[PDB]
Amino acid sequence: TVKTGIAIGLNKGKKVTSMTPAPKISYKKGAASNRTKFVRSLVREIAGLSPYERRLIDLIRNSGEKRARKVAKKRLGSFTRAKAKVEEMNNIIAASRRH
C-alpha cells in the first residue's frame, strides 16, 4: 500500500521487498468441482427442507426482503449468518417451484 520508509505519519509499515511466494494451503474451502456439488444434489434433494425454513420461504417473496430477514435473524441468534443462510435460500426457491 505504498509505504513511507521513514517515521510513521501517513502510511503504516515498512518497504518490505517480499518475494511473495506461496501463501497458505486452505484459503478457498469451497469451489466448483464435481464432488462438492454432487452431495447436495443427491442428499439435500431427499429431505428437501426443514420445518423452520418452510415458513421463511414464504416471507421473503411475499412479505418483502426486510422484516422477513429479521424473523430469521432472531431465529438463529445473529445477523452475521443472514447472508450465508438466507441468501442461500434464493437458489433453493428457484430450484423448486421455478425449476
Binding site: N34, R35, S41, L42, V43, E45, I46, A47
Partner: protein, 192 residues
C-alpha cells in the same frame, strides 16, 4: 418400521419384496463368480512359486479372476468412474441412517438399482458373512445374455417406481385387536 404406523418417504421399500422366480436365477448367476476361500488360496501360493516368484511373471501366466462387484456404505470409485450396474440392498440394516440415501446413489447416475432382501447367502461367495451389491463391468460372453435380460426386468419393476413412491407417504396396514373393534364400529354406524 413398515408394519405399524406410517413410513418415511425416503425409504418405503422394505414392504416390497422380490419374487422367487427371478431371484432364483439371480443367485445362481453369482454362483460361478466367487473368489477362492482362504483354505484354497494360501496353499496355491506354493504352487506358483516356480512360475511367478522364480518364473519372473507378475500377473502374466495366470487366468483372469472374474469377480463380481460389491460395496454398500462404502462406494466412491464406483460412482465417479461410472462403474455401477446391478445394485442390491441389504436386508436387516441396523444403521437406520445408512439406508435413506442408497437409492439416491443410483437414481442420479441412472444406475439400475434392484430392491432385494438378503446379503447372508451372497456373503458365502465373497468369503465373508455379509454381502452387498453385485454388479458386472467385465463379464464374460458365457453369461452375457443372462445379464442384459435381467436389466429390462429391474428397470420395469424398480426404476419406474421412485418418484411416485417419494411423493406418497404409505400406510393403511391393519394392526391386530385394534381392527377388531374399529372396523366393527363403522359397520354399525353406517348400516346397523
Amino acid at each position: 418400521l413398515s408394519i405399524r404406523l406410517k413410513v418415511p418417504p425416503t425409504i418405503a421399500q422394505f414392504q416390497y419384496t422380490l419374487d422367487r422366480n427371478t431371484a432364483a436365477e439371480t443367485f445362481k448367476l453369482f454362483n460361478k463368480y466367487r473368489p477362492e476361500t482362504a483354505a484354497e488360496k494360501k496353499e496355491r501360493l506354493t504352487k506358483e512359486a516356480a512360475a511367478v516368484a522364480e518364473g519372473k511373471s507378475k500377473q502374466d501366466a495366470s487366468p483372469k479372476p472374474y469377480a463380481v462387484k460389491y460395496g454398500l456404505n462404502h462406494v466412491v470409485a464406483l460412482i465417479e468412474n461410472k462403474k455401477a450396474k446391478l445394485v442390491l440392498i441389504a436386508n436387516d440394516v441396523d444403521p437406520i441412517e445408512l439406508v435413506v440415501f442408497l437409492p439416491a446413489l443410483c437414481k442420479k447416475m441412472g444406475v439400475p438399482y434392484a430392491i432385494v432382501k438378503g446379503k447372508a447367502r451372497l456373503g458365502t461367495l465373497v468369503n465373508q458373512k455379509t454381502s452387498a451389491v453385485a454388479a458386472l463391468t467385465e463379464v464374460r460372453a458365457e453369461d452375457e445374455a443372462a445379464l442384459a435380460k435381467l436389466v429390462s426386468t429391474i428397470d420395469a419393476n424398480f426404476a419406474d417406481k421412485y418418484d411416485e413412491v417419494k411423493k406418497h407417504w404409505g400406510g393403511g396396514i391393519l394392526g391386530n385387536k385394534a381392527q377388531a373393534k374399529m372396523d366393527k364400529r363403522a359397520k354399525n354406524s353406517d348400516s346397523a
